[PDB]
Each structure stands twice: as C-alpha cells, then as structure tokens.
Design a protein around this nucleic acid. Structure first.
Ligand SMILES: [Zn+2]
Length: 240
DNA sequence: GCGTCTCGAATCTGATGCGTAACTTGGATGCTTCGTGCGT
C-alpha cells in the first residue's frame, strides 16, 4: 500500500462507482491522496462544497478526485474511519485506550494507516500518510500530523514506572492532554520536575508532539493492558 | 529723665473587650455529509 486511497480496493474491495469521467489528458495527482490520475483512470471533478474545511490539506490544485477517494469521502466511510487503523488484513478500531497502547507499543508489521478524529466527523483517511515501518508511525489526529515512535513511548513509560515505583500516590511526570489542547501539554509536572534526573527530564522534553499525544492515552496511574482491536471492515461495508 | 533679688518644684507619663459572618466555589462553542425542498 502506497497511497491513502489504496485502502479501498485492497481491504474494502469496492468496485468504482458509475457515471465517472475518464481522464484523457496529461497525468495529474488527486487533489486528496496525491495519487496520479493517468489516461484511462476513472476520476471525477471536485465538488467538495462550502462545508469542506480541508483546503489546506489538498495534495494538488488539479480539482480532480479519483474513484477510491470518492468512496472514501462518503459519510459512512468518514464515520467508520474516525478512529480506524487500516492494515493490509483489515480495518481495526483504536478508539479504546488499550487498543492505542497496543498499537503504540506492539504495532502490526505490515504497512498501515492510523486515523483519529478530534471532533464529531472529519476528513482523515485521504490525509494520513502510510506507515512504511512500524518504528516510525505516522498518526493523523484531526488536523495534526503526528509522528509516534514506539521505542520513545516505551522509554517514557519506563521512566514513569521508575519514578513512581515506590510512592503510593502515582504522579504523572509530564502533563499530557488527550486532546492535545491544553496550554500545559508536554510541560513537566512538579513531581517529575523534582523527582527525575537530568537525562530523563531532557528525554521527556525532547519527545515529538505525537508521542505526547499517545502518552496522554497510555500513561496513567493504572496503565492499560494492550489488547488487539476488533476488525471493523465488515461493519463499514455493511453500513455502506 | 531709676533697678537687682525672684525668673518653681514633683508627680502622673492608662486600663478592658473586640481582635467577623454568609454566599460565590462558571457557562457554551469550535462536524461534515446526505436528502429534500425552496428560492433565483
Ligand atoms: Zn485520491
């Protein structure tokens, strides 16, 4: 899998819609997934409407949308892929905290896309870049493009465990917000400020925003136990 | 067209209570599509 639109024909196996124009000009990328639209490929002109708030994330100004993206842009597809992890095998739901911990500590090997909506409904799937290697996971949370490294997540979890192994009252070394919205997101808490060594503080201050967002779900007083998410592509196909 | 002496002294020079009370102690919002009508 190479493009976000590749999930349609590879895990949803949906044939293209009808009434679609056929490109008969010089190739140009899809305005959504940057996929080339060569001669003979089925496309459709852009008709996003006045409620499209993702003009900044458009891959190109070609005003053309491939059929895979047209399938992806359906309301049933948007709602189904709000908290979805699309691997080669199928589509899983990472909405639960345990699923997030499993994904960010024991990721699947194959290429996969990670989606997470920050609101009721958002355009995600055609914006998420593919994660080619599980060591450098690219996560699209709403409008933010996050890079999550599972090794850094594990190291931060170990740092917290060493910090709070003895004290009965568990305290978060770093202030984290699940929405990545608080003005104190990523700042060191007091307990971590005078209970962590210089190296651990330096490591905590030098984590990517995506790692802070992930730890905002995985790092708590009682760490969630990782579990495999349930397959969802059947539900999405049935509702489509 | 008069002046000296005299031209103070010794206390006392605060004391007592009161020297807070009740409420308030946040709220709401930051999605986009699909279908069905309704104005140019
Ligand atoms: Zn596309």
């Amino acid at each position: 899998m190479r493009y976000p639109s590749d999930v349609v024909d590879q895990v949803f196996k949906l044939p293209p819609d009808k009434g679609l124009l056929t490109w008969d000009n010089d190739p140009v990328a899809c305005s959504h997934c940057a996929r080339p639209i060569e001669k003979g490929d089925l496309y459709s002109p852009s008709s996003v409407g006045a409620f499209f708030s993702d003009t900044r994330n458009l891959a190109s100004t070609s005003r053309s949308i491939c059929w895979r993206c047209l399938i992806l842009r359906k309301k049933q597809m948007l709602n189904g892929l709000s908290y979805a992890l699309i691997t080669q095998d199928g589509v899983f739901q990472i909405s639960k905290d345990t699923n997030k911990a499993w994904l960010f500590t024991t990721p699947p090997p194959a290429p996969f896309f990670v989606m997470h909506s920050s609101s009721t409904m958002q355009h995600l799937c055609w914006r998420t870049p593919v994660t080619l290697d599980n060591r450098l996971i690219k996560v699209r949370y709403g409008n933010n493009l996050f890079v999550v490294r599972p090794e850094a997540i594990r190291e931060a979890l170990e740092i917290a465990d060493r910090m709070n192994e003895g004290q009965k009252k568990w305290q978060a070394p770093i202030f984290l917000d699940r929405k990545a919205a608080d003005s104190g997101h990523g700042a060191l808490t007091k307990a971590g400020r005078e209970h962590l060594s210089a190296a651990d503080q330096e490591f905590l201050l030098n984590i990517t925003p995506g790692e802070r967002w992930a730890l905002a779900y995985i790092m708590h007083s009682k760490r969630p136990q990782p579990e495999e998410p349930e397959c969802i592509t059947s539900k999405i196909l049935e509702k489509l």
